[PDB]
């Protein structure tokens, strides 16, 4: 089986080529799912199928031309729901962990993002934090005590026509002891 470039091969048919778009590929019998960018590694003439540490192919040679591509998986990350109690309100905020939302706020297409509640991308204004932007909350800047943690020192709450907000953590009220060199306070 496949260790070298093939020469026999069965029937099938050839169908164009696209780049920087999540498609399904069957390049010579290797199936998968990912995007095909442009690579710069120089293959030896007797080496075609590149590999890595995890024994997964990530560099292939287009059988028809001599272009060298790379295989990387499509986007994927976690989803969290920021909510108050059931008997308080019903609005939420979906947190997209570990993604830079410059392409996921587009969201709506012919069955792209797997969750079905992708309508929030056209809803409330997004706000980017260090752990991935959350959709469904607005960023006030005055300080409050932390009620629900999110990450990287951002804590949300339920401010009371009322919607949930996200702010910056406040460690406590600032105090300053009037230090001197002749001052003693004794409790009474």
């Amino acid at each position: 089986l496949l260790h070298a470039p093939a020469t026999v091969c069965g029937p099938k048919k050839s169908t164009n080529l696209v780049k920087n778009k999540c498609v399904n590929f069957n390049f010579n019998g290797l199936k998968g799912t990912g995007v095909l960018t442009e690579s710069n590694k120089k293959f030896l003439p007797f080496q075609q199928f590149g590999r890595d540490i995890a024994d997964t192919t990530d560099a292939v040679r287009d059988p028809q031309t001599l272009e060298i591509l790379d295989i990387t998986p499509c986007s994927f990350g976690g989803v969290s729901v920021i909510t108050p109690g059931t008997n308080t309100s019903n609005q939420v905020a979906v947190l997209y962990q570990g993604v830079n939302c410059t392409e996921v706020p587009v969201a709506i297409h012919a069955d792209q993002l797997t969750p079905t509640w992708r309508v929030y991308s056209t809803g409330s204004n997004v706000f980017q934090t260090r752990a991935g932007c959350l959709i469904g909350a607005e960023y006030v800047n005055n300080s409050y005590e932390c009620d629900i943690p999110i990450g990287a020192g951002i804590c949300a709450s339920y401010q009371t026509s009322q919607s949930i907000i996200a702010y910056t953590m406040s460690l406590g009220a600032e105090n300053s002891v009037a230090y001197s060199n002749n001052s003693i306070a004794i409790p009474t």
Partner: protein, 50 residues
């Protein structure tokens, strides 16, 4: 004339054994959080989702 589709539904039973309330996972993130905690009330907090 409606039309049915394959879905996951959480159903609540009473003492006699009659369905009194139901919810689905794939409609609302609030509904998904209800549908993943096995309850119709969820306490104020962050919850992991699929």
């Amino acid at each position: 004339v409606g039309y049915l589709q394959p879905r996951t539904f959480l159903l609540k039973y009473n003492e006699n054994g009659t369905i009194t309330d139901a919810v689905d996972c794939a409609l609302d993130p609030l509904s998904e959080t209800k549908c993943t905690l096995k309850s119709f009330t969820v306490e104020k907090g962050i919850y992991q989702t699929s």
